């Protein structure tokens, strides 16, 4: 199919330059992007999706759009306007051991020693046949230099990226899924080979 296929390409096209929406976005572009993702989640090919977790939701998922924005005072506290480049965001969902990993990678644009990541181990469970109840277990900033940079603001950072709560899985394709957590956030993720992490 190409209807939701070319709509998917359209969403991919509207996202370019917005940096996954993580440092804010003009409101008309946000309305546009939510229009496209609600068009997609209306056209869900995988209904009833929490019993199809392993062949649809299992795998390594790279973030391509989310409503999570880091702006203002916390962008400044984290050093994220001029020093640290918020890199990729992954959400490997492994259904065997019933896990949910959030890997948020970081950089410093010259420092080979700062190129670390924030890891967030979570464990989910299926409450509703379209929802999953996620709970946080472990959290980690590595290496110790990045942890040195973020440690005084560790809880703010984790809380930005904490997958706890629930995740209602609206759209599920083989290379793209769309989620909506309890905080009214949209998470548009795509497939990434687990070597990307």
């Amino acid at each position: 199919e190409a209807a939701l296929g070319d709509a998917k390409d359209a969403l991919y096209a509207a996202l370019e330059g917005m940096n996954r929406g993580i440092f804010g976005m003009t409101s008309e572009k946000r309305s546009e992007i939510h229009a496209l993702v609600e068009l997609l989640e209306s056209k869900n090919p995988t209904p009833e999706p929490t019993d199809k977790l392993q062949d649809k939701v299992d795998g390594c998922w790279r973030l391509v759009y989310s409503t999570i924005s880091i702006l203002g005072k916390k962008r400044t506290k984290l050093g994220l306007r001029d020093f640290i480049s918020l890199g990729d965001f992954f959400q490997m969902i492994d259904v065997k051991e019933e896990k949910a990993v959030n890997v948020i990678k970081f950089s410093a644009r010259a420092l080979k020693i700062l190129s670390g990541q924030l890891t967030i181990e979570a464990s989910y469970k299926i409450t509703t046949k379209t929802k999953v109840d996620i709970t946080l277990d472990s959290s980690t900033i590595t290496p110790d230099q990045l942890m040195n940079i973020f440690q005084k603001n560790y809880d703010m950072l984790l809380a930005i990226f904490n997958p706890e709560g629930w995740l209602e899985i609206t759209y599920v394709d083989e290379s793209l899924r769309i989620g909506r957590d309890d905080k009214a956030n949209i998470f548009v993720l795509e497939r990434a080979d687990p070597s990307e992490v």
Partner: protein, 325 residues
């Protein structure tokens, strides 16, 4: 009311100082000779060394000194080299092509020469100050330099922080501007030999004069048009640096808080924030903020016997306050 009318009272002091500083900085180094002529725009008629010279002369007359000492003049040069060196270094840090229309040393000669020139002036000031041999003045001025460091830290820390208060802002204004003036005027009083009461009233004269000055430059970065400024109007705001007009506006306007929190994410959002400042009447409460600062400064000077030294000091205050009509 004008600048020259104020500075003519110590025009001669100011000229000797400008000559010494051009001679010293730019020490028979070709590039530094040019940069010193560029930095010390002939005449030496700049506010900070002139305040040093006016408090120097007012308090000296009050004390019975027939001339200004060597300490008073080394102090005006310390103050001027510190101020200039800090502005050069501040333009390299946070890359700036212009400073009040004039082009920066960093732009004309490059970062390497600007850093060398600022370092050289800071070294010269360190040494002049050590050789004043007044531990209290050395401490005041070392506090000014340390407060430059504190101000850089706190400025980077409070970017886009809509919960900054007016005491926080006034401390950033102190760190930036008021500290060096307050220090220079208390030190001028100290070297004149007048009492600790007159030296504290001159610290408070310089502190509130420098706070009024900073508040009024904070206002003019809103009022003045984008051509009167080398910058767009409201460039302290675009950049995350919330000054007292914005702080007064965010006390009652919530929409402005959503605008600054997005870091002006919406398009046209800086201009919307500008008009919310002009509508909030935060500019008028900043105008009165500046007037109250200046009036504490004018009341600071009442310890000084009548003269044209302290009349020019009161007109320092008045010129500042009428720079915002």
């Amino acid at each position: 009311m004008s600048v020259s009318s104020l500075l003519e009272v110590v025009a001669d002091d100011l000229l000797k100082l400008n000559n010494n500083l051009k001679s010293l900085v730019g020490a028979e180094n070709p590039v530094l000779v040019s940069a010193a002529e560029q930095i010390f725009g002939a005449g030496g008629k700049r506010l900070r060394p002139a305040l040093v010279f006016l408090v120097s002369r007012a308090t000296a007359e009050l004390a019975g000194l027939l001339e200004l000492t060597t300490e008073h003049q080394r102090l005006a040069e310390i103050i001027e080299m510190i101020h200039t060196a800090s502005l050069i270094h501040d333009d390299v840090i946070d890359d700036s092509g212009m400073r009040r229309g004039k082009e920066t040393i960093h732009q004309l000669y490059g970062t390497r020469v600007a850093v060398l020139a600022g370092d050289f002036m800071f070294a010269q000031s360190s040494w002049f100050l050590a050789n004043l041999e007044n531990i209290e003045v050395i401490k005041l001025i070392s506090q000014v330099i340390k407060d430059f460091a504190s101000g850089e830290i706190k400025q980077a820390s409070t970017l886009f922080d809509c919960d900054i208060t007016l005491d926080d802002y006034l401390l950033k204004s102190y760190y930036k501007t008021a500290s060096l003036i307050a220090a220079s005027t208390r030190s001028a009083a100290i070297f004149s030999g007048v009492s600790t009461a007159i030296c504290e009233q001159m610290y408070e004269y310089g502190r509130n004069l420098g706070l009024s000055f900073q508040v009024v430059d904070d206002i003019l970065d809103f009022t003045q048009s984008a051509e009167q400024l080398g910058k767009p109007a409201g460039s302290d705001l675009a950049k995350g640096n919330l000054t007292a007009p914005v702080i007064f506006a965010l006390q009652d306007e919530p929409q402005l808080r959503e605008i600054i929190d997005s870091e002006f994410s919406e398009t046209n959002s800086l201009a919307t924030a500008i008009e919310l400042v002009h509508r909030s009447g935060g500019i008028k409460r900043a105008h009165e903020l500046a007037r109250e600062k200046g009036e504490i400064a004018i009341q600071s000077l009442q310890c000084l016997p009548r003269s044209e030294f302290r009349s020019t000091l009161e007109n320092m205050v008045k010129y500042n306050l009428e720079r915002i009509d």
